[PDB]
Amino acid sequence: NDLERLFNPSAIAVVGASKDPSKIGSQILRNLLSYGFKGKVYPINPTADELMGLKCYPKVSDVPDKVDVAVISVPSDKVLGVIDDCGKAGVKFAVVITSGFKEVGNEELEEELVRRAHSYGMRVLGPNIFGYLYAPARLNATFGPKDVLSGNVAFISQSGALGIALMGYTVVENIGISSIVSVGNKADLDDVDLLDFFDKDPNTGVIMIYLEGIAPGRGRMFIDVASRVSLRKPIIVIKAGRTEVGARAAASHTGSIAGSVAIYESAFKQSGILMAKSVEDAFDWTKALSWNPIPEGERLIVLTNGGGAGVQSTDTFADNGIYLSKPPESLIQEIKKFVPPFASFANPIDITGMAPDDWYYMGTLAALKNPDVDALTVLYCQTAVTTPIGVAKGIVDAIKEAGNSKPVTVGMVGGPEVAEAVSFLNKQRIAAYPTPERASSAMSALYAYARARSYVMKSLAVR
Amino acid sequence: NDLERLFNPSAIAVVGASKDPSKIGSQILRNLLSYGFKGKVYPINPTADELMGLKCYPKVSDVPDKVDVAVISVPSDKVLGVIDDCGKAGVKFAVVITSGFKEVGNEELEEELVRRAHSYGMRVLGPNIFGYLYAPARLNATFGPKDVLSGNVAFISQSGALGIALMGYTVVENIGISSIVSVGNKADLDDVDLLDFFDKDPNTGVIMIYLEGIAPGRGRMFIDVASRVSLRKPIIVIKAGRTEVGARAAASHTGSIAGSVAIYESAFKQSGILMAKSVEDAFDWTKALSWNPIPEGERLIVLTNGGGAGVQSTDTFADNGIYLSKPPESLIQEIKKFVPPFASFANPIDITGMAPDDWYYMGTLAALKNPDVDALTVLYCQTAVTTPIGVAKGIVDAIKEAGNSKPVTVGMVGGPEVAEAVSFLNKQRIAAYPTPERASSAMSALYAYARARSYVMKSLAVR
Amino acid sequence: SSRDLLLKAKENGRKSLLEHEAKYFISSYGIPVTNIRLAKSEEEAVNFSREIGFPVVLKIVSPQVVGGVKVNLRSEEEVRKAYREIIENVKRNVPNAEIEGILVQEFAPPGVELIIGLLRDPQFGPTVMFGLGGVFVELFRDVSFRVAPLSEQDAESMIKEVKAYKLLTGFRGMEPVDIEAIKDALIRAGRIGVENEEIAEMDLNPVIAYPKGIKVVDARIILR
Amino acid sequence: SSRDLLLKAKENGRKSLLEHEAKYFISSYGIPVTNIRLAKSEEEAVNFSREIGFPVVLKIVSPQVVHKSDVGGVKVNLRSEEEVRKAYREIIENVKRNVPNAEIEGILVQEFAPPGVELIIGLLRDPQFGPTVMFGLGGVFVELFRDVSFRVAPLSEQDAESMIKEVKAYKLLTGFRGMEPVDIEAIKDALIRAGRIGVENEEIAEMDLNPVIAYPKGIKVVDARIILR
Numbered sequence A, B: 001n002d003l004e005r006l007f008n009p010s011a012i013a014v015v016g017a018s019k020d021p022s023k024i025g026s027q028i029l030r031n032l033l034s035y036g037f038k039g040k041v042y043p044i045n046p047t048a049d050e051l052m053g054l055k056c057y058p059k060v061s062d063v064p065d066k067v068d069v070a071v072i073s074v075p076s077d078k079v080l081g082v083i084d085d086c087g088k089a090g091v092k093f094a095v096v097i098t099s100g101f102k103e104v105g106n107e108e109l110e111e112e113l114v115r116r117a118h119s120y121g122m123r124v125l126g127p128n129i130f131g132y133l134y135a136p137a138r139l140n141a142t143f144g145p146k147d148v149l150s151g152n153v154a155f156i157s158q159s160g161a162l163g164i165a166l167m168g169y170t171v172v173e174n175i176g177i178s179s180i181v182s183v184g185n186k187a188d189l190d191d192v193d194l195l196d197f198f199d200k201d202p203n204t205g206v207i208m209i210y211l212e213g214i215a216p217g218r219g220r221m222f223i224d225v226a227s228r229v230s231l232r233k234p235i236i237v238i239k240a241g242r243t244e245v246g247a248r249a250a251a252s253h254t255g256s257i258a259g260s261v262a263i264y265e266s267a268f269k270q271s272g273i274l275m276a277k278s279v280e281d282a283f284d285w286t287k288a289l290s291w292n293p294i295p296e297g298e299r300l301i302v303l304t305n306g307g308g309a310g311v312q313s314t315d316t317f318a319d320n321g322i323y324l325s326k327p328p329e330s331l332i333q334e335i336k337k338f339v340p341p342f343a344s345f346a347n348p349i350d351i352t353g354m355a356p357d358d359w360y361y362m363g364t365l366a367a368l369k370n371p372d373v374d375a376l377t378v379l380y381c382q383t384a385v386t387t388p389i390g391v392a393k394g395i396v397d398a399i400k401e402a403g404n405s406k407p408v409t410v411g412m413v414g415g416p417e418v419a420e421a422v423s424f425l426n427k428q429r430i431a432a433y434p435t436p437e438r439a440s441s442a443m444s445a446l447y448a449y450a451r452a453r454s455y456v457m458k459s460l461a462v463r
Numbered sequence C: 001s002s003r004d005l006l007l008k009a010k011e012n013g014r015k016s017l018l019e020h021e022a023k024y025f026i027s028s029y030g031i032p033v034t035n036i037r038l039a040k041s042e043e044e045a046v047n048f049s050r051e052i053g054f055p056v057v058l059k060i061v062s063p064q065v066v067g068g069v070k071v072n073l074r075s076e077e078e079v080r081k082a083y084r085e086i087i088e089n090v091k092r093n094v095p096n097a098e099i100e101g102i103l104v105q106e107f108a109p110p111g112v113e114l115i116i117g118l119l120r121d122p123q124f125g126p127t128v129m130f131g132l133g134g135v136f137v138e139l140f141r142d143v144s145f146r147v148a149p150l151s152e153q154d155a156e157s158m159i160k161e162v163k164a165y166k167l168l169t170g171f172r173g174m175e176p177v178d179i180e181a182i183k184d185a186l187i188r189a190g191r192i193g194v195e196n197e198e199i200a201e202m203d204l205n206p207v208i209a210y211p212k213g214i215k216v217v218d219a220r221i222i223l224r
Numbered sequence D: 001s002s003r004d005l006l007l008k009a010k011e012n013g014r015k016s017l018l019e020h021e022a023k024y025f026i027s028s029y030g031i032p033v034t035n036i037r038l039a040k041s042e043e044e045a046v047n048f049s050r051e052i053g054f055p056v057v058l059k060i061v062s063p064q065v066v067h068k069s070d071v072g073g074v075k076v077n078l079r080s081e082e083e084v085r086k087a088y089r090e091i092i093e094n095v096k097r098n099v100p101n102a103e104i105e106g107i108l109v110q111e112f113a114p115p116g117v118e119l120i121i122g123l124l125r126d127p128q129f130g131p132t133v134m135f136g137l138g139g140v141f142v143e144l145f146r147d148v149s150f151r152v153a154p155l156s157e158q159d160a161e162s163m164i165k166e167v168k169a170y171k172l173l174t175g176f177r178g179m180e181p182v183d184i185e186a187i188k189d190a191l192i193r194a195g196r197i198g199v200e201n202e203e204i205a206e207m208d209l210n211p212v213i214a215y216p217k218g219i220k221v222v223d224a225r226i227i228l229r
């Protein structure tokens, strides 16, 4: 079933808005308007005639318009009533904020909600969610932050509080968002339906999912869909319940049985999915995949001032099954024009600690231009000889003057000035990090996805 | 082998200072005065009459004083000359900045440097180092940042550029430093000699080491000393060369043969040492160990709003061999007075996402006061219902009002307002982190050290 | 018509296949098995033992169910001793059962033992499991999983996943085994699960791997 | 003392201890070994086998032939005094033809060792940390998978116990199909004494206790290799 009208609705209704601006229904209404929804918004309230300067209606079906989406923010004992009115009004999607369903043991009520919805040809998101956001439609139907950075990352969250928090965290980590979707209890619409939409969506290039579990009998379809998506768009899953003890903890908070850990891991491999063990990993990888093409080969080059950062990088890469190889002679000789003879060209390429700013420019440029180099990680350790910002600008210039598009991550270590340089680089969608390991972990994700894509390609090879 | 006069010298000489403020010798000299050394400083230069407003001398032996330490910043072909003069002047410690020794193949020269020094009863730090710093003596004999935050952390670095950079990084991560020591080539003084000093030093409470390798026949002594220190002070080692390929890379940059990876890992275990695989881990742990006592029991309590963060935390703790247990009934009952009945008390204790600011105070207070609780990790996910700073202040108040000292880590997830709250907490030496996994990893380091200390105690038990 | 075996079983209230019916079934899917026939007496058995080739081993085949196994019957005249002894052994040790007969089983040379499993995961449906036999699954739990249907890529990689993989690539007193035959078996195992909804789980244990080809020695098929 | 074996060897240019000398040595440190005696004739061989108990294994003890199994200088499972004489002469017959001028110190009589869980205990000298004890389960688990643990000597009881639990094959010691749990305390004991040997005897470059068999009570070293320097 097509979700075009959910993400790009002509008209949306907010049921549960109130004169009280504190209530959740009103918070949603405020986000819609502030984020700049260009369609029609119809507040629904039993008493008010006007909310937020918009004509309010007692019921959705009293609205003289075709309402595509209805955000339901009323207590659980009132939800079924609204569903019928919505069904009568021919609304196609009910976005149910309301809690008090399967997660608290009342599974009977949830199954009824979905049943009555379907009888009207209506689909249900949630329930027990914080809404959803779609940047390409200037649509913020959540009670989270009023804003996000625009970009190509879709985030699907099965967690409420964490999801709504991570929504705000994306700004701090400079991640561009195309969509935020709280899926909650997944009583009806789930990750498979959404993956199908984001597969087609030219605005979404990366998909990140916080996943606690999928519905029984849904896993096979999940692999078929995810697997085809992985061919063109990387999927990162933050698995809640990677351990036996954690699986049971997630099962409780969710209100469902815990599936097999080992089998979930296999399904992710068969789908070409990258599994992250932590929020930081997910966001670090996401940032790199969102801003870079896949490496076309294994000729990875590490560039550093001093061996310390290089060795940390070499260890990190090796932990991810990536092993550096001797660099092209054409590159070495290009660098040997300014670098002292005693320096190391074993890869990582050490240009010595006392190296000035322009050496980062020349070395980064030489590396990218060279046709035998597929990818580049640049590591910088702050010293009195350099300026962190001058190094960052040298790297920016070398990217633009290379006149190409090769994957590149940056790791910068130092004081307050380095924090600024790193921020500066990320503002220009260049994956930069405050440690060499994290920069090496980011680059490793690019290679992990390449190899994951290759896995699926071989898996679909025709007999 | 007494290093009291190295870290707490009455008089220090800087050989290699110049009228040219750009040269390294001058950068060192500038740091000594800026950091506020209260002792006597003696610039040494063949011609100058006064550097930095200080009477300069052509050579150390011409100084009308007993010089404890000499920082040597002259080319390698002049170092031996200066050593002889220092020896004549009865200098106890030669701190040799100069490069161009064993790391570039000139091992003969290095062994000669040490030999001639020893003949005068003089000790050598380095060579090939960026100097050292000791906060309790207001002594900054480096050409790195002019300042650091004061605290109880000693940092020993075998890497030059990474070490000097990490020195600056400590400020960003709000780590209080007692000492920075560049050991470089370890031609003479090494980690064993330094561990002996920091063992006795009442200013140092945590010791962090960037370690590429140990000298042949030195490892046995290393375990005896390190294990003994681990009994009272935690030691974190960032091992460069945790992999075969990385070991070789570290070996090159160092100019020495690579030792066995598995055997280093064993030695660290026998020494009660925490091995970090990354800079972020090391600093995250260091921060927690520096600001907290070790837990006296396994009664760890996680406090969270919404299961999402709780499950990430449960997974991380389990990955580190820590498993949460049912909380004390007294605690559940104390919390159940404001928390809804449906909430989860399985540990993590979920107080629901829509929990207001005050609930973090009440819950953190109740947890710390309860005599059956040994340690506490508080997780927070930003929502419109709370204020990140109000939550942080609630936690500060509860710690102060609990009137005790139990280990505590905080994990906060959200936008810019969370970034400030986290900074605020670390500013008050409360270990706070921007993700639940990192906060859970920090707390795991406290327990890892407890168990590491217990390991050494049992190995030293009298049969 | 291979499905006749599952239908006749469901008809007779049985929730699993007898040892021989289970092998016939997986053999119809192209998974190599040790050759067998089920004895309806001693006379049928000895001739059956005469029929499939020597030496031959005897077991017990009854939906009910210890000391019901023999070894190395060399001669057609000799065979007579062991059958009676089993039916002599069973009654003294255990009184009641409908005995479909005694299995006349082909001898299997020693080799590298394997485990191939089929289970139904609630989320992902039919899933194939792999691992090396002996202590490596029973004790260490060194197994890999793939959700069916299996591609050749899935089969190849799940084999290399296990930590005991090197036991397939040659070691002390043991030459490398036919990995292609294993891959083939794993894919057909997955096919059995996808196609037969009435199979709840399947255990191929032990499966022996040789330099060329493999042999399922015992097969367990549970119904639902 | 025990060091006489190490000294006489250094004197005779040898860089290792003969199989029997290696066992006498580790036995003097309290590491239980498979019982053995050195036969100087046909007559002595019979009385020792009578003394050690049947069955018995025989080997040639000579510094020249490095491997005894394929030269034809080993006879397994000799149950009777008649069997040993047969096997005794066959060895002295195989030996002369395969090597005429080897120096035969005698024939070794080995106690049969019941089957059990095979172990490996090693002693190596690391450049950084000096004498180090290695542990791991025998067979494929070390030769193939390389599943070993290390501890730097001297070993405490704590070191010994934890390095045993460190290995991934540990569960082969806690009982499994057709095998009762084995004496972990005896293993700990042996590991500590192995480390002591390394610390005290600088002239030992490496030591391999392989195979070591572990029983529900006690253990027995079946073969020991001590390399010198």
Ligand SMILES: CC(=O)SCCNC(=O)CCNC(=O)[C@H](O)C(C)(C)COP(=O)(O)OP(=O)(O)OC[C@H]1O[C@@H](n2cnc3c(N)ncnc32)[C@H](O)[C@@H]1OP(=O)(O)O
Pocket: A015, A016, A017, A018, A019, A020, A023, A024, A025, A044, A045, A046, A047, A048, A058, A072, A073, A074, A075, A076, A078, A081, A082, A097, A098, A099, A100, A128, A129, A130, A160, A161, A164, B306, B352, B353, B354, B383
């Ligand atoms: C960050 C996270 O934790 S996300 C997790 C997922 N979501 C949650 O946790 C939500 C938790 N809260 C709930 O589930 C609640 O039941 C909510 C938010 C749905 C409703 O709470 P409230 O706002 O207090 O409900 P309330 O009863 O006040 O109804 C809201 C408004 O809708 C109105 N309303 C009630 N019934 C109807 C109806 N049939 N049609 C239209 N409006 C209606 C009410 O009158 C009220 O407006 P008013 O102020 O004019 O009277």
Ligand SMILES: CC(C)(COP(=O)(O)OP(=O)(O)OC[C@H]1O[C@@H](n2cnc3c(N)ncnc32)[C@H](O)[C@@H]1OP(=O)(O)O)[C@@H](O)C(=O)NCCC(=O)NCCS
Pocket: A353, A354, B015, B016, B017, B018, B019, B020, B023, B024, B025, B044, B045, B046, B058, B059, B072, B073, B074, B075, B076, B078, B081, B082, B097, B098, B099, B100, B128, B129, B130, B160, B161
């Ligand atoms: C030590 C090092 C910095 C010296 O380089 P430099 O500053 O250019 O050396 P110079 O030749 O200019 O000597 C420095 C000053 O000491 C003076 N000097 C030389 N020999 C001297 C002596 N025996 N006694 C006193 N002063 C002496 C020089 O005259 C000069 O002073 P000036 O400018 O007034 O003439 C350099 O050899 C080096 O090793 N650099 C790398 C350091 C490094 O990377 N360390 C590792 C941590 S990252």
